[PDB]
Structure formats: C-alpha cells, structure tokens
Design a protein around this ligand. Structure first.
Ligand SMILES: *[C@@H]1O[C@H](CO)[C@@H](O)[C@H](O)[C@H]1NC(C)=O
Lengths: 49, 49
C-alpha cells in the first residue's frame, strides 16, 4: 500500500490572517510578500499533487 | 489591473506576455448585507413608576 497524493489544500493567506477586515489587512501589507509567497508555496504543492 | 480578469493576471505575474493555463488571481469574498441584533423581550421593567 502506498500513498500517492495528499489532499490538495489551498489557504488564502490574506483572509486567514486578517479575516473579514480591512484596517487589519493594511498592516498585512507592511510584511511584504509573505501572503503572496505563501500561496505560491501551497500552489506548488497542490500543482504537483 | 482592474480593467478586467485578463489584466489582473498581468498584475499578478508582472508580465505582459502570459502563457497558457490557469492562474489564480484574487479572492472574491461575498460581502455581507447589513446586520442583525436579537435580544430577549425586555424580561422586566425596573420599578420606575
Ligand atoms: C417575545 O415576544 C413575542 C411576541 O409575540 C413572543 O411570541 C415570544 O414568545 C417572546 N419571547 C421571549 C423570549 O420574550
């Protein structure tokens, strides 16, 4: 028996962190590309899956 | 960026040339309508009279 795929899961980084908000999200931009470089990671996974 | 979907891509990829294949761009989050406040009926009246 072998694993082959794992469940494809993408997670919006911008909502998870700042949910349903704005004046939260403005802070989230001061951290740079984290959110945008995460979804890249979790995509690279979910693509090769 | 906002003209239309195709031109959101180019703003994600930082490219005018965009090759084939599905890209994620943004996240549409249905925005609420108004509000609901719901509390029991008054339960009591402080002996004002
Ligand atoms: C509140 O008022 C309505 C008026 O019809 C009544 O039907 C209901 O049972 C009441 N409930 C409470 C928790 O006050």
């Amino acid at each position: 028996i072998l694993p082959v795929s794992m469940t494809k899961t993408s997670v919006d980084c911008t909502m998870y962190i700042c949910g349903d908000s704005t004046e939260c999200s403005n802070l989230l931009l001061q951290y740079g590309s984290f959110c945008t470089q995460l979804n890249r990671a979790l995509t690279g996974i979910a693509v090769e899956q | 960026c906002a003209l239309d979907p195709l031109s959101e891509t180019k703003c994600t990829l930082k490219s005018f040339t965009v090759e084939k294949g599905i890209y994620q761009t943004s996240n549409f989050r249905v925005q609420p309508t108004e509000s609901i406040v719901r509390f029991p009926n008054i339960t009591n009246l402080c002996p004002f009279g």
